[PDB]
Amino acid sequence: HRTIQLPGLINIAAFVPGLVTRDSEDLQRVTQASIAAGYSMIRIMPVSKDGSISDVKSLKVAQQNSKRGVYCDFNLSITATSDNANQISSVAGEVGSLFIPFNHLSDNISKVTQVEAHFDAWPKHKPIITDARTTDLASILLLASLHNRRIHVSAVTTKDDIKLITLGKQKGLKVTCDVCVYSLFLSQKDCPGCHFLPTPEDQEALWEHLPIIDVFSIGSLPYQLAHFLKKEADVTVGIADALPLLLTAVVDGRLTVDYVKTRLHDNPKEIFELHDQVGATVEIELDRAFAVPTEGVWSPFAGKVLKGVVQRVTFQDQVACLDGVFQPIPPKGADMS
């Protein structure tokens, strides 16, 4: 029975449906399922179900929802819009990153100009993250190069985009990227109607560019998939699946433990300037098989057998999980901003 000791892991994209809902338990519960899965630090995706962290008011609602106590450490983030660059800059010290989606932006004026404003107003050493594709992606990569600062591209899915990122990297452009774990194990072959999943050719291009991929994230893809298939809006979809899917690929000889570790700890920690966590540890029975629970949270792998059981997670001097089972200890997590 193979056992490995890992530090507390990092998910740079944790989706919280009721993030900006008043008095919502969503954020807390996401931190529960996170620590139970081995993630002692998560970045909260500023875009939620029917809202987003886009202004001062929105930030505070998200902050209040953390006051009832969290079970892992976390950072908030803020979404860019057409007229946002001003207010979100006065609040940069309370969040850990700026998220720039291109669907939030106005058609009245060059989306290049709108993004340039944030690049002018946002601190140069504070991370910026985007889900831009194709020409939007090339546009924000140009700005990062022209301001000689860093840019992180999230939920990469296509051959075209990962190859453009490869080219940027070779020319010294300060770009990093992640893929959602589900993207590596689900494609349009598995769901032709799901055009947010990669094509089989896209997915193969992702496996062939693993050196280019700096980070693994969970993302909103698990939630987007479940919603499109009309399952329960369960707030923890995809959290307990991600690492076992990766460790199953390790056992199958497609990945190495160190690659997984760097993509879920070392690299996300440096790119997003995250602090050290003393006392956060994860013990994993790498070879132990288990059936993806056909009960609790919906999973596209329900009833399938994966490898990789989270034997023990420590956090803040307490045992936060045993055999993947959340331990009802006092919440000791904190906002790291």
Judge residue 299's burial from the number of C-beta atoms within 10 Å of its C-beta, 0-12 exposed, 13-18 middle, 19 or more buried: buried
For residue 6, count other CB atoms closer than 10 A to its CB. 19
- In this structure, what token pair is assigned to residue 49? 């179900």
* Residue from 277, 288, 280, 291 nearest 251 by CA: 288
Provide the token pair at 93. 């010290």
CATH number, position 254: 3.20.20.140
* Integer angstrom CA distances of residue 89 from 56, 103, 327: 10, 20, 38
Helix (H, G, I), strand (E, B), or coil: what is residue 219? strand
Residue 104: which of 175, 185, 46 has the closest Cα?
A: 46
- The candidate with the shortest Cα–Cα distance to 173, out of 140, 201, 216, 202, is 140
Domain that holds residue 289: 1-337
Report whether 176 contacts 271 (CB < 8 A): yes
Crossing angle for the helix pair 134-146 and 111-121, to the nearest 10 degrees: 40
Whole-number Å distance between alpha carbons of 145 and 138: 10
- Distance of CA 259 to CAs 10, 136, 154, 165, Å? 14, 29, 18, 19
* Region of 253 on the Ramachandran plot (φ > 0 left; ψ -120 to 50 alpha; else beta): left
Strands 78-79 and 73-75: unpaired
Strand partners, 290: 306
One-letter-per-residue 3-state SS of 241-267:
CHHHHHHHHHHCCCCCHHHHHHHHHHH
Cα torsion for 266, 267, 270, 272, to the nearest 10°? -120
Domain count, the chain: 1
- List the alpha helices (DSSP H) in the chain: 26-37, 56-64, 85-89, 111-121, 134-146, 159-170, 181-185, 200-207, 221-228, 242-251, 257-261, 267-271
Cβ-in-10-Å burial (0-12, 13-18, 19+) of 301 comes to middle
Q: Which two tokens stand for residue 1?
A: 């029975």
* All residues at 6 or more sequence positions from 292 whose CB lies less than 8 Å from its CB, including other chains: 241, 244, 299, 301, 302, 303, 304, 305, 306
CB 74 within 8 A of CB 28: no
Q: Solved how?
A: X-ray
